[PDB]
Amino acid sequence: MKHHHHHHAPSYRVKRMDIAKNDEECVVNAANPRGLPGNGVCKAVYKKWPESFKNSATPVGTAKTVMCGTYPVIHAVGPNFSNYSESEGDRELAAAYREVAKEVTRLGVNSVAIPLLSTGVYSGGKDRLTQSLNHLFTAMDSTDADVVIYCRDKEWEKKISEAIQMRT
Ligand SMILES: [Ca+2]
Ligand SMILES: [Cl-]
Ligand SMILES: [Cl-]
Ligand SMILES: [Cl-]
Ligand SMILES: [Cl-]
């Protein structure tokens, strides 16, 4: 059974920087179903933890953890909204985050670095910040890990921070 330090109060934070530089105990990749190096976040994850791509292929709506050494990389496959309808894509996006929460719990980590799934090249050309962040919260709220959300856009940083602060 998992125990924490007496001071542990689970938190959310957002940082605008490359998730490959994260200071957390594990990382969530914005993965593609075939386990390819990809682009954007996925390519940064591939450059930093290439060993974690051994047998990382997994279906849309799921997560698969592969260790790089002892450092866990949770490959979470959100839907490409160019291929899915809005209703089906929304369900798969929510499902991918639920699988992340299960993996974070199983691993026993105290913290996790997470990107906003399906907000980059899989967004179908739409702004999906609120949709993706709300599914992240829905899955992660019941976990006790410190969650650090990574983004790259300055306006997105502000909106994510606002959403975090308004629930506190
Ligand atoms: Ca699926
Ligand atoms: Cl950076
Ligand atoms: Cl892809
Ligand atoms: Cl994406
Ligand atoms: Cl961003």
DSSP letters spanning 113-164: EEE-TTSSGGGTTS--HHHHHHHHHHHHTT--SEEEEEE--HHHHHHHHHHH
**Does 3 fall in a domain?**
no
If one counts the domains in the chain, the total is 1
- From the CA of 94, the nearest ligand is 1
Task: Answer yes or no: is 123 within a domain.
Answer: yes
* Structural domain for 37, as ranges: 12-162
Q: How far is the CA of 115 from the centre of ligand 2 (A)?
A: 14
Q: What is the 48 CA–ligand 1 centroid distance (Å)? A: 27
Q: How many A from CA of 151 to the centre of ligand 5?
A: 4
Method by which the model was determined? X-ray
Reference 165, options 9, 17, 14; nearest CA is 14
Q: What is the resolution of this structure in A?
A: 1.4
Residue 46 maps to a domain: yes
CA distance 132 to 45: 20
Asked if residues 55 and 28 have their Cβ atoms less than 8 Å apart, the reply is no
Domain assignment present for residue 78? The answer is yes
In a domain, 43, yes or no: yes
In a domain? residue 86: yes
Distance CA 32, CA 40 (A): 11
Residue 152: give its domain's CATH number.
3.40.220.10
CA of 10 from ligand 2 middle (Å) equals 25
